[PDB]
Amino acid sequence: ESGVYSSANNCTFEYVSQPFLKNLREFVFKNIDGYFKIYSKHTPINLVRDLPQGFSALEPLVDLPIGINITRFQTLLALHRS
Amino acid sequence: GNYNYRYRLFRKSNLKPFERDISTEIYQAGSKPCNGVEGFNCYFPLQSY
Numbered sequence: 314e315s316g317v318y319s320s321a322n323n324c325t326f327e328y329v330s331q332p333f334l335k336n337l338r339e340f341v342f343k344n345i346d347g348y349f350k351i352y353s354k355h356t357p358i359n360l361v362r363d364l365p366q367g368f369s370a371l372e373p374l375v376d377l378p379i380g381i382n383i384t385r386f387q388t389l390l391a392l393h394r395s
Numbered sequence: 396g397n398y399n400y401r402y403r404l405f406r407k408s409n410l411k412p413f414e415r416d417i418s419t420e421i422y423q424a425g426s427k428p429c430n431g432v433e434g435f436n437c438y439f440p441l442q443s444y
């Protein structure tokens with residue numbers, strides 16, 4: 314784990330828990346009143362390109378008591394650096 | 396005189412409930428753009444007791 318973080322200053326919160334992961338993985342991220350809520354669901358997808366037709370609920374997964382003025386976000390990849 | 400107990404005095408707007416601000420930057424108190432130069436109409440919000 315040495316992706317981009319190089320000047321990590323003194324900070325507050327750290328946490329570790331179980332890993333999450335033709336797999337349709339759906340996640341919902343919410344930020345209300347300094348609280349971070351994460352819901353998730355995993356299904357076996359068999360459709361070619363886009364979302365399927367049906368219905369499937371999402372269970373609550375994690376809550377975090379951290380207050381951040383979040384405005385933007387990005388996805389993290391692991392390219393074949395070789 | 397204990398001057399370690401300081402607090403932020405000036406800010407652009409109010410705060411949402413239960414959050415913290417650690418922005419140690421010059422605040423423009425008027426029409427003069429501080430631009431990291433301080434001066435008139437520019438104050439350091441953190442001041443002690």
Ligand SMILES: *[C@@H]1O[C@H](CO)[C@@H](O[C@@H]2O[C@H](CO)[C@@H](O)[C@H](O)[C@H]2NC(C)=O)[C@H](O)[C@H]1NC(C)=O
Nearest residue numbers: 320321322323324325399416417418419420441
């Ligand atoms: C620990 O966090 C505090 C909270 O900001 C840092 O205090 C100031 O940090 C700024 C950088 O944004 C410096 O320019 C100031 O000189 C710091 N004030 C001090 C040291 O009294 C502090 O720097 C952080 N600790 C470290 C090692 O970076």
Ligand SMILES: *[C@@H]1O[C@H](CO)[C@@H](O[C@@H]2O[C@H](CO)[C@@H](O)[C@H](O)[C@H]2NC(C)=O)[C@H](O)[C@H]1NC(C)=O
Nearest residue numbers: 381382383384406407408409410411412414416
């Ligand atoms: C969270 O950060 C954003 C960063 O843009 C803040 O949005 C700015 O807030 C100031 C406050 O006076 C406004 O003057 C700007 O016009 C806002 N810019 C944008 C692009 O929205 C936002 O206020 C922050 N949330 C807080 C402080 O609760």
